[PDB]
Amino acid sequence: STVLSFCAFAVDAAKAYKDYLASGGQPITNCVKMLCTHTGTGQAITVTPEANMDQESFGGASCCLYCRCHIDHPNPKGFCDLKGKYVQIPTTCANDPVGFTLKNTVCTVCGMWKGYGCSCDQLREPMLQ
Amino acid sequence: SNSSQAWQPGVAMPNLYKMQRMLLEKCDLQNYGDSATLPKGIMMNVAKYTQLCQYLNTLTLAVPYNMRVIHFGAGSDKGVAPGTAVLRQWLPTGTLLVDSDLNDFVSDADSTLIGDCATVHTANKWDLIISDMYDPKTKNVTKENDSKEGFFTYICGFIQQKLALGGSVAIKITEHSWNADLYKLMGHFAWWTAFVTNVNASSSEAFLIGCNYLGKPREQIDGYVMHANYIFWRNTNPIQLSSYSLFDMSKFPLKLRGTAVMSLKEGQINDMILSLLSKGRLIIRENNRVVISSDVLVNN
RNA sequence: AUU
Ligand SMILES: C[S@@+](CC[C@H](N)C(=O)[O-])C[C@H]1O[C@@H](n2cnc3c(N)ncnc32)[C@H](O)[C@@H]1O
Ligand SMILES: [Cl-]
Ligand SMILES: [Mg+2]
Ligand code: NA
Ligand SMILES: [Zn+2]
Ligand SMILES: [Zn+2]
């Protein structure tokens, strides 16, 4: 009742990490990178590694700030959308998978990262035979 | 250091070595401690578990729907579970994966148990047991290389009471981390071997693989002689460090065979059933609700 | 054993 009041005002682990990175702090290491073909669907979070040629696949739990820092997940059920799954991270951002999952959101339509694979907002293509 | 073995995920102990009567002696590897070249940013244990799984794909593992897999020694000094992530990738989606370790860690397993494996209890039988447990005090060789009786006594008991007939195991051993009773139990499987991953060929490590549990001794094995046979093989067959198998993951996933699961009584096990178990075509156990727990010591 |  008054704990959730304090939590909603100061313990915002997500922003703390973003500020920590802006302060020059080294990103969370030991994210588990998986061996894969790199010829997958390229979707964001999958039941098996789906990295394409421009991504790295990681074990989900190792890339979750809440799992790694042993903190409650930010949602009523306290459910984790990474644990037990594989998160695809653009190779350019594979140096900080925890930071990438926090600073980005998955497209509910195609299941791709917004700004990194999602093409739902591109102009209408002329039809192809 | 044979070059033909370099494109394999690793090397299995040749059968002729298992039939010898060797005296135990020091394991002396021509390339001890050498590090293999791993793919960029890939952890040693992701590479090691990937090669173990690549080898397990060539055996007759029973793979039923709702397969039950338990992974002991899944934790690491990194606080994450690389091996569990590989098993999850390897096993069919929907496979029940439970892991465990003495120290807390973040895991991709459906459930994680923290504490000594001796504190882990289950009322269910399992289809596959993976153990990477290794006692840190094994590094402090205080006496002779005798059979070790810490977590190995628990694993021997778990195999004899909680492994479904037709089930398989992959238990990590080293020159000093081994148990005579575990080797004796390899004789209770339709087939067994000691497998060395090519990425860790410079170590005395090997996985004792029991394929298709028969619940009874198919062959009588003297564990003290079989470990001496294993060391003789490692001492006279240098294995070239290799990560080549890690670069082709196209055939990596374990194929979901949908192996039949039946709850037969011990009085129904006959030559035809044993023969079906031996080919990875049958799992024998009930299919009750999976119940597992880790004891907590109560004190002030 | 956790290159
Ligand atoms: C080499 S580490 C395992 C590495 C892990 N397999 C991975 O994927 O990186 C060996 C582990 O065995 C565990 N272990 C040793 N004795 C144990 C016991 N009696 N019960 C449970 N875990 C034990 C240690 O806590 C340690 O985490
Ligand atoms: Cl060598
Ligand atoms: Mg090594
Ligand atoms: Na899988
Ligand atoms: Zn999480
Ligand atoms: Zn989209």
Numbering used by the authors:
A (entry chain B): 4264 to 4392
B (entry chain A): 6797 to 7096
Sentences from the paper on this structure:
Crystals of nsp16-nsp10 in complex with SAM from different crystallization conditions were soaked with the custom-synthesized m7GpppAUUAAA substrate in the presence of Mg2+ or Mn2+. In this crystal, we observed Cap-0-RNA, SAM, and Mg2+. The capped RNAs in crystals #1 and #3 included the m7G cap, the first three ribonucleotides, and the phosphate group of A4. The m7GpppA in the HBS is stabilized by stacking of the m7G and A1 bases with Tyr6828 and Tyr6930 residues, respectively. Of particular note was the space between the Tyr6930 and Asp6873 side chains, which is occupied by the A1 base in the Cap-0 analog structure. In the Cap-0-RNA structure, this space accommodates the stacked bases of A1 and U2, with the U2 base forcing repositioning of the A1 ribonucleotide. Superposition of the Cap-0 and Cap-0-RNA structures revealed that this repositioning involves both a 0.6-Å shift of the A1 base toward the side chain of Tyr6930 without notable changes in the positions of Asn6873 and Tyr6930, as well as a 0.4-Å decrease in the distance between O2′ of A1 and the SAM methyl group, which occurs without apparent changes in the position of catalytic residues. The movement and alignment of the A1 O2′ atom toward the methyl group of SAM may explain why the additional ribonucleotides increase the efficiency of the methyl transfer reaction. Although the superposition of Cap-0 and capped RNA structures revealed differences in the position of the first adenosine, no deviations were observed between Cap-0-RNA and Cap-1-RNA conformations, indicating that the A1 base is not repositioned after the methyl transfer. The structures are essentially identical, with the only difference being the methyl group, which moves from SAM to the A1 ribose hydroxyl group during methyl transfer.
